Design a binder for this molecule. Structure first.
Ligand SMILES: [Zn+2]
Ligand SMILES: [Zn+2]
Ligand SMILES: [Zn+2]
Ligand SMILES: [Zn+2]
Ligand SMILES: [Zn+2]
Ligand SMILES: [Zn+2]
Length: 247
């Protein structure tokens, strides 16, 4: 409906998540959904439905997040979704659970640190992300090559299809850790934005329930537990939990 009652009746919550954005949302070698956003999703299903296994996870491209929640394909988006005023015209955001800024990653042998360095060159972005929207709006002089999926986008960077790739910095730090010929040579392109769950526009019933759940997870340690399970192993002491988690 996708109201609380309607979802209880179906016995399963459909949740939009990433398949290829570790450590936020991905699929492990056993074909199981994992990551920070997924842990939050399992917590919500346990409270709503009585069991964390009552989520149907639906793999969502960045560009499809709005459409999937709008059309009813999912009940809720937890595909690491940055809240923006433009997006908020199309969907309703619950209370934020994390924050993130954009960054730019490039090979260590040709680091990119400023926009003039993109002259006559290509920047890679995952289509429909805040990095895509940022460069399109604020740097129209920069030539973009866009791919639907994260794996394609980072593969194109490995293949030299562009000189750099822009995305959430936390993603770029996690990726560069396992790809050490790259560095995040621009760590921050401006103030951090919140990441938040999203429901269909007008769905105040599910929105209100999601808000209470997020708030409760902040207070009772469930959000901190999710960060310790999925994020802390990646960043260690290099990124303080108060830099990632939303108050
Ligand atoms: Zn019915
Ligand atoms: Zn510019
Ligand atoms: Zn696609
Ligand atoms: Zn493709
Ligand atoms: Zn390749
Ligand atoms: Zn490793």
């Amino acid at each position: 409906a996708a109201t609380v009652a309607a979802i209880k009746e179906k016995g399963v919550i459909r949740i939009g998540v990433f398949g290829d954005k570790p450590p936020f949302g991905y699929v492990d070698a056993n074909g199981k959904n994992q990551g920070f956003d997924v842990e939050i999703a399992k917590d919500l299903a346990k409270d709503l439905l009585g069991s964390p296994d009552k989520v149907e996870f639906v793999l969502t491209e960045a560009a499809n997040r709005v459409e999937y929640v709008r059309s009813g394909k999912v009940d809720l988006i937890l595909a690491n979704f940055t809240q923006t005023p433009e997006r908020a015209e199309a969907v309703d955001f619950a209370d934020p659970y994390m924050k993130v800024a954009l960054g730019v990653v490039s090979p260590k042998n040709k680091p990119i640190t400023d926009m003039a360095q993109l002259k006559d060159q290509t920047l890679l972005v995952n289509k429909g992300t805040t990095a895509d929207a940022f460069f399109t709006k604020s740097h129209p002089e920069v030539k973009l090559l866009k791919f639907d999926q994260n794996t394609e986008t980072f593969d194109a960077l490995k293949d030299g299809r562009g000189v750099a790739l822009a995305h959430d910095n936390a993603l770029l730090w996690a990726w560069a850790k396992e790809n050490p010929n790259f560095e995040v040579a621009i760590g921050n392109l401006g103030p951090a934005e919140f990441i938040a769950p999203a429901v269909q526009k007008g769905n105040a019933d599910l929105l209100n329930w999601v808000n209470g759940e997020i708030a409760a997870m902040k207070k009772d340690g469930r959000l901190k537990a999710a960060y310790e399970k999925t994020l802390l192993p990646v960043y260690g002491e290099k990124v303080k939990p108060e830099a990632l988690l939303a108050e």
